[PDB]
Amino acid sequence: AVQIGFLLFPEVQQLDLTGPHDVLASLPDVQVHLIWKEPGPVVASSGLVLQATTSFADCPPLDVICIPGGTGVGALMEDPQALAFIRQQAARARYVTSVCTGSLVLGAAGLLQGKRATTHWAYHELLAPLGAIPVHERVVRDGNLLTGTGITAGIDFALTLAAELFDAATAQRVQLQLEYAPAPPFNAGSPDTAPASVVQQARQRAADSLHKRREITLRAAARLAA
Amino acid sequence: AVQIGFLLFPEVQQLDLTGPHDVLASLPDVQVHLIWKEPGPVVASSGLVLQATTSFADCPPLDVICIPGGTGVGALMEDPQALAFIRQQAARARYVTSVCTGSLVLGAAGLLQGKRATTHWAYHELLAPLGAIPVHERVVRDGNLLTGTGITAGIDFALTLAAELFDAATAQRVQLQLEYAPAPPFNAGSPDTAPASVVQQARQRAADSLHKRREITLRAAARLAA
């Protein structure tokens, strides 16, 4: 059975996790884990309550690890227990993946040093100090590392993982079973396509968070320099 | 504050709910409810554990009600307490919405009689016996009723609801904040675009479920005929 694990942390952006979870849980011979320090309730940034299924110590060796993003990323970038767990699992995993600001956690763990990667558009400047080669593309692969942008990046790259772990026909079957064919009613999902006025509103609303994450990123980078 | 409610039931397809939940919970002056018979744990079809926040009796009058789909729809189509709650809320709601097989629950409640509607492709034949005018389109509006197909239909129609409840700039801002710009790596999300071999595999895997839901649908239709 393929072992797939998601890190589930307080103030996660739950859709970053719940999207790929439902797709990958549709596959035969897959066991999916929601990992935190102990099993039990974890509250997402919206207030949605999720349940972690396993502790760090009890988690099996994973074939796929996925780090979601969210508000809670800032704390996770300076959580030595979480970072050590991610490094341990990444050593032997077939795929190391992240959604949105989850790539900043991979960066804090030292797993982006010399690697091409992306993250959420408003935080993209934080990749270079963590040793990454920043790339402005929605899905960036570098060896066994996949980083994706967008709250639903994990749905799309879950279909890629299904095709590689199984075969294309299996991925196509899951897509059809889920009738997955998105058609957004607006075209404002990138700072390159949204109106300039909207980009300004979004940048101003992210400014306090970016300021705090500049400070955290520099401390995380200092630990990597040691 | 706009009151938005999702029905949360055992064996729900959780992404049908968790997608629109995260989008709508991003909006100012919105309270989102997860409704079941009592607050507490509800297990999705994948095994993911969610928590209902309110009972039927305690739920405020809703501006938006959303019925997700999933395995668990069959039981809900013959749950008189759930159907009565949906009818009560639909009477005064500004929007009555469903994702995937959630429209079969609206059908069992009598809310599709004479209305254009869609549902999951494998179950589409069950709409006509529930009094609907079946339409093969991904999002179908008829007055205040929106029915959508695809596990992520609710993400897309949540942006439409945001634009109508607030304004287009608000919907565009939420889309940009979430960097929502899907790009599936396969084109098999419709029986019209998937390979014929894949459509056969998917139809054969749905056959037992369809057979059971034919039986349930006929009993539900008999109750509407009374």
UniProtKB/TrEMBL annotation, chains A, B:
GO-annotated biological processes: regulation of DNA-templated transcription
Top-level taxon in the UniProt lineage: Bacteria
Annotated DJ-1/PfpI domain residues: 4-163
InterPro entries per record: Class_I_gatase-like (IPR029062), DJ-1/PfpI (IPR002818), INH-QAR (IPR052158)
Pfam families per record: DJ-1_PfpI
Record-listed Cysteine sulfenic acid (-SOH) modification sites: C100
SUPFAM superfamilies per UniProt: Class I glutamine amidotransferase-like
Listed name of the protein: Isonitrile hydratase InhA
Source species of the chain: Pseudomonas fluorescens (strain ATCC BAA-477 / NRRL B-23932 / Pf-5)
